[PDB]
Amino acid sequence: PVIHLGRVLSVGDGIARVYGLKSVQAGELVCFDSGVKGMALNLQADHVGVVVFGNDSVIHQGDLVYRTGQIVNVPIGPGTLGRVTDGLGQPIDGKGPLTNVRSSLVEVKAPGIIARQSVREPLFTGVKAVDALVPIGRGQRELIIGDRQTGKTAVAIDAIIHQKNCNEQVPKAQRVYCVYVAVGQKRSTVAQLVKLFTQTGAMRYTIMVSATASDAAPLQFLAPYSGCAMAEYFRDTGKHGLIIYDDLSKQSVAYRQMSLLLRRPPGREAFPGDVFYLHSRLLERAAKLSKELGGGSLTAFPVIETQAGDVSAYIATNVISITDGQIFLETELFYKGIRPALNVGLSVSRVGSAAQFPGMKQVAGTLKLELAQYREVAAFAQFGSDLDAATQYVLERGARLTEMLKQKQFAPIPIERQTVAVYAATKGFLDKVRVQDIVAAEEAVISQVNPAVFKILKANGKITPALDAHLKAELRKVKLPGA
Amino acid sequence: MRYTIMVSATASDAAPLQFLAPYSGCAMAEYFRDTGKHGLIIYDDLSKQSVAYRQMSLLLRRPPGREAFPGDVFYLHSRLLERAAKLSKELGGGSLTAFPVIETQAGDVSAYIATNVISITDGQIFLETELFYKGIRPALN
Amino acid sequence: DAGYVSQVIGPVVDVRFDGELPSILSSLEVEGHSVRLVLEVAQHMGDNTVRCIAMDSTDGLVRGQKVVDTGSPIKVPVGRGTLGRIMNVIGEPVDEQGPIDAADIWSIHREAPEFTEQSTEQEILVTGIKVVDLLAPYQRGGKIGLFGGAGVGKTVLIMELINNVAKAHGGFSVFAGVGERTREGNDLYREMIESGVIKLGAERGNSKCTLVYGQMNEPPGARARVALTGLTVAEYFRDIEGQDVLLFVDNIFRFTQANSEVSALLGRIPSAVGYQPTLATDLGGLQERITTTTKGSITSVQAVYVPADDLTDPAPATTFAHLDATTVLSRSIAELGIYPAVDPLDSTSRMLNPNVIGAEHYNVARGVQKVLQDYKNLQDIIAILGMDELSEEDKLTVARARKIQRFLSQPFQVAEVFTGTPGKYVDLADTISGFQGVLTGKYDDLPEMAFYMVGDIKEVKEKADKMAKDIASRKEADNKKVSEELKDIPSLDKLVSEIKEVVIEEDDGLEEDFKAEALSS
Amino acid sequence: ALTGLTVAEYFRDIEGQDVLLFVDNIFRFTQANSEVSALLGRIPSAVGYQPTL
Amino acid sequence: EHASRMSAMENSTKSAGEMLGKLTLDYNRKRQATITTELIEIIAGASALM
Amino acid sequence: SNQAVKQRIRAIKNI
Ligand SMILES: Nc1ncnc2c1ncn2[C@@H]1O[C@H](COP(=O)(O)OP(=O)(O)OP(=O)(O)O)[C@@H](O)[C@H]1O
Ligand SMILES: Nc1ncnc2c1ncn2[C@@H]1O[C@H](COP(=O)(O)OP(=O)(O)O)[C@@H](O)[C@H]1O
Ligand SMILES: [Mg+2]
């Protein structure tokens, strides 16, 4: 085991220039003699540029840099489930070493064309604004793009919390194991999510990869790839994953820091030229594999923060090009009382209704059409010009429908309940109801309607004609507020 | 074609060919001006020529300007367009009429190259795309 | 002899050659790498060093690694042996089906044909899409551009273009997938096994399409050269076999984007929008090869991504001067529900001269554009006031344009899974006959939603009477069906007992699965 | 600002009590590092700010 | 009615010329700031190479 | 964000 040695030439701003280390590979983990790790990124002819995984205060001029022989890797496996790890593998929850785990590379080639199949089975978010209008299949990357505090994290947490509710009812094969990558966030904020996920029970299926704001910029650049490598264990072995990159906007800023300090020339907004390749390398690893490769899937949720609803932003435009769908969250819809604040006119799902619930594929088709008729007639009654009484019908029904899509932040509804709720609003059964108490009318519609009619709609996946009449004959034997 | 010369530096040609083609066509057209006859020089895309000249200057590492164009990019187009003159009677009385073509994007004449050629030329024929869909043709503003 | 790697910065590799540097644009191979890593010489740095872009990832490159010059550019297999196959940027098969037959492999770098061997012939390519074949009709042998931002329907339209003009025509087809989703490249592959365009196995020679795929996970050196690889398969069919060939390129924007990702590492100062300084001439070198020559004809359909619904941006704006038909797709047409979301005014073709398509096609298209432009000048005052003070000359052209707007919408045969309706192929004569009726008031009595997502004008009359029957049939289910049917709806617990319960394991299987993979391999 | 935290961190870590920390103009710490980052030989980030913002 | 709409539609051309005046000052400020921003992005990419 | 302020000058000028 001959070990090549590199002498540090200069170290500043978390970057160390190293003389020697000719044998070192590009993207290879190096080891300083202070104990702090590093990664050789640009191999120049006279020196090596090393980004430092930690605080560069312990590195001096002339320190000895050893190469480890290995490209950067993380422990993957089932032993990472339940644990809070840092930007590259190492657990920070104080529960010992990662047992029952295996070290795999963080920069893997994404699965090509012959390794895919069509995204057909649904991943239920539990957010009925999502599962009706912008539904998400297993193997589909969906952007949650929004403003600074538009509830983007809440949409992502409700996807994780809902999988725990689904994993107790499905067989062992079709269980979704979540990974939440928190990039550049507060450590207090991350600790409120681990506190939520153990109280909910979602921490049994969740990996929490945490690269906080105190961490080095190569630890937050690398944490989406290390969390995707932990998430790709379940995709590669036939199970189903769910990776959430909360603030890929903060990963690009950490990647702009290393690029600007490795002297790479700045592009738009002082960003690296290969920034698009930064996120397209990562998000194209979210795939639905073929049945020759196990049939496993990985569903991605990148989170991008905009500034003033400016989706024309450099990094924002890149990820809208990469991802399939888009969940756009608006600030003025948030304060109008519409929670989650989903811009239905701007939120798409490129997989579409091919990978959604069949019990809502027929019910939410008229939902998004009546909401499309609601949008332009509300722009004209904003002024107060005149009425038509057929314009006022779609302006009144869509106000029930907008009020129907509102949901509690920490409670994710099951798909069977959401379809019944959307049926009671799209089949007119929630007319004769004031527009204000539909947020409280549907608690009656879920409770008073029989708990055994949800089982038939869950098992069939579709309102059969022997159930389409039986539940609309139960949507009349219910007592609604006011009436 | 019995009265027309066509100087064609197309898209696959090198950026020095597209930069020099308005000057090559002007020198062919300056023959008629200098011998008492009358010329009509049309540059299909002056803006395209300035994009080709911005390519050579950024690659020769000359300092970039407002839109990364060279500092003399006004001197690029003025030295070309001031060659369109009406000569005096003791120089034959010949003439050269220029029609530079500048493509704007979303109809703003506040663009760097568009502000330059508006300064150099005498008039402008503004063609508006809103009038183009109204049936007007030529959509002259 | 062989050169050695001297610098690795991202996707840009410097190779030092002691004696006889390779030519610019020539292919180099790094041996000792984990995968086949092909470099392409971009420039001579000067001190016996070339600067190269990699066709794969540079993770694992070492300074001093041996590099072998092939004395040639990147050579890919072209010919009949590639029909029905998926190729790499460097010509490798990625469809898991043997090696490619490779009769006369060809360099992916050549010049544009000439000015002398250009074809000045205009004949209309009938697509079946009635917004296309009316207002911006495509040319059989010309370049077609599909513009639009993210999510307006660039693929849905280029997919409907594949099974409408490439499914039954004389020659071959090439799809160049340039820097897009791998998922939709797999969706395109499996769609063409089912429609018999690509045949697998011993029926492979009867295929009519070649895929060349360079999708978004590939490095910028790879995606910058995939369109040149898809050109080279299409240039063999035009130059050597002398026949017509269709060439579909998904987001030619990604060719310009990939060159800008490596541009600052090649030592170039940035341009106005952060693009490479040679943006118009890198794009111009690619497009000037996609031409109809005196040997054959390449009918090109290129999707062009505009970055923020912005046609002002220089990468779409440079592409506009290269095309013969620029179908511009708009977000405002897509949010209104009209699909294909083609901007009827902004879509421009060179086949829209009256001496090319006749006068009965030119005046209908010029008449539809006039009514749709007048409505947009009235919609400034309709959304404020509300269509009561227009003196019923401008009220008639609002209702005429609203019928024209829905009659440009059409169900696609590839959007049956999306729209939920079977697709319609509208002939060219039925488009001119239909829009001349709405323009001259022949169909004022029909509802404006009877025009929405129909084939032709005989399906508007087939839908308008259907709509009247539908609303006159609403008042019949208000009598019965609430109580005591003929027992086709049984009791609830009857249905709960038919529910076949699954085995919910409650062990997750995981830690014995992981050790089972450990004792394996 | 780091001198002010260190006084507040002693009362939190060693003394073990509740501290009220009032920082006036926290942006000034970012602005002062941006006056310095130009002179440390660093390529400027978006809006002329230090890359390590 | 017509003489109160005349005084109302002259108070709303005043209000749509005062709003248009504040919006052109806001646009000229953004026009100036985006030429300065795109220029600093060009000099920084050039100073990183020279 | 320079087109959102330019499409508002489209609105107020026709109003
Ligand atoms: N549907 C909802 N109903 C009620 N409150 C909600 C809802 N969604 C989010 N909130 C609350 O609104 C606030 C903002 O939500 P959240 O923090 O998830 O947004 P974000 O987009 O992640 O913002 P940040 O920039 O802070 O990450 C939080 O207090 C959250 O609990
Ligand atoms: N012709 C169409 N008919 C119906 N829906 C369409 C059509 N074109 C696009 N869509 C919808 O809009 C989305 C955008 O289409 P896509 O081809 O992915 O656009 P782009 O490639 O320009 O981003 C589709 O996923 C689909 O939901
Ligand atoms: Mg696409």
Side-chain angles (χ1 to χ4, degrees), chain B residues 10-15 18 48 51 54-55 58-59 61-62 64 67-68 103 105-106 129-130 132-137, chain C residues 112 267-272 277-278 280-281 284-285 288 312 317 321-322 345-348 362 366 369-370 373 377:
Chain B
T10 51
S12 49
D13 287 5
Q18 308 177 12
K48 248 138 234 65
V51 159
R54 182 185 54 200
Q55 177 178 327
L58 286 190
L59 284 170
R61 297 212 172 182
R62 310 210 156 155
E67 250 175 88
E103 169 196 297
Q105 291 88 17
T129 177
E130 295 179 355
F132 196 77
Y133 290 127
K134 288 169 192 167
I136 323 206
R137 253 151 234 231
Chain C
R268 302 167 181 157
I269 305 177
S271 224
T278 40
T281 43
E288 285 326 287
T312 304
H322 282 102
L345 299 175
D346 218 339
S347 294
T348 308
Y362 179 75
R366 273 282 271 142
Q369 265 159 12
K370 174 61 175 175
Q373 178 63 78
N377 296 130

Side-chain angles (χ1 to χ4, degrees), chain C residues 52-325:
Chain C
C52 303
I53 55 170
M55 303 300 116
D56 214 356
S57 187
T58 63
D59 278 327
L61 271 187
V62 171
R63 295 162 303 170
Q65 196 148 348
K66 185 184 236 222
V67 169
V68 159
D69 174 1
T70 78
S72 199
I74 295 181
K75 276 189 165 182
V76 297
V78 294
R80 302 287 188 93
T82 76
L83 286 173
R85 315 294 313 274
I86 320 176
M87 295 212 315
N88 219 8
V89 57
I90 55 184
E92 297 179 311
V94 298
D95 56 336
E96 200 186 2
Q97 299 216 328
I100 311 181
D101 277 3
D104 198 12
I105 70 169
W106 262 15
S107 170
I108 73 169
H109 277 104
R110 52 192 35 86
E111 296 288 309
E114 275 299 327
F115 180 74
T116 71
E117 41 167 19
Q118 290 284 332
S119 174
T120 60
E121 274 83 10
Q122 313 202 23
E123 40 175 347
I124 178 177
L125 171 82
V126 185
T127 45
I129 304 164
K130 52 186 162 172
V131 60
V132 162
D133 278 333
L134 183 87
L135 301 167
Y138 294 167
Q139 177 188 144
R140 185 180 302 258
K143 302 189 194 65
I144 295 144
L146 318 179
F147 285 77
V152 300
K154 302 178 236 93
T155 298
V156 168
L157 179 71
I158 210 167
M159 212 65 57
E160 177 85 351
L161 271 156
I162 281 181
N163 67 330
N164 278 2
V165 308
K167 197 146 163 49
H169 92 100
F172 302 132
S173 189
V174 175
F175 192 88
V178 185
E180 272 300 297
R181 300 160 178 86
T182 316
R183 163 195 70 89
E184 65 194 22
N186 167 263
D187 285 22
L188 195 143
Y189 182 52
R190 301 302 178 182
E191 193 45 56
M192 297 208 306
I193 314 288
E194 293 159 3
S195 53
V197 192
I198 292 189
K199 312 180 176 306
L200 308 181
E203 204 178 2
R204 193 267 304 155
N206 307 316
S207 298
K208 307 197 78 171
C209 189
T210 298
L211 309 185
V212 173
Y213 266 107
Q215 302 282 59
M216 264 188 311
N217 51 323
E218 297 221 317
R223 305 185 251 104
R225 302 278 172 260
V226 173
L228 308 187
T229 303
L231 255 296
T232 313
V233 188
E235 283 179 299
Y236 186 88
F237 291 141
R238 178 200 65 194
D239 291 359
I240 296 299
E241 286 189 323
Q243 52 187 117
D244 296 332
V245 55
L246 263 48
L247 176 58
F248 305 94
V249 184
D250 213 86
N251 279 329
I252 207 61
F253 171 77
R254 309 291 212 197
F255 162 71
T256 74
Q257 172 162 51
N259 294 289
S260 70
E261 299 191 59
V262 295
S263 166
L265 289 182
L266 294 179
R268 302 167 181 157
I269 305 177
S271 224
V273 187
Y275 284 109
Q276 73 264 38
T278 40
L279 160 81
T281 43
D282 288 338
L283 188 60
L286 196 145
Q287 304 283 310
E288 285 326 287
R289 293 167 53 178
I290 320 172
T291 53
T292 298
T293 314
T294 62
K295 301 171 182 163
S297 180
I298 304 184
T299 304
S300 179
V301 183
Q302 288 146 98
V304 188
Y305 169 70
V306 314
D309 304 322
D310 202 15
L311 307 149
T312 304
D313 191 274
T318 308
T319 322
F320 267 117
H322 282 102
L323 310 154
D324 299 309

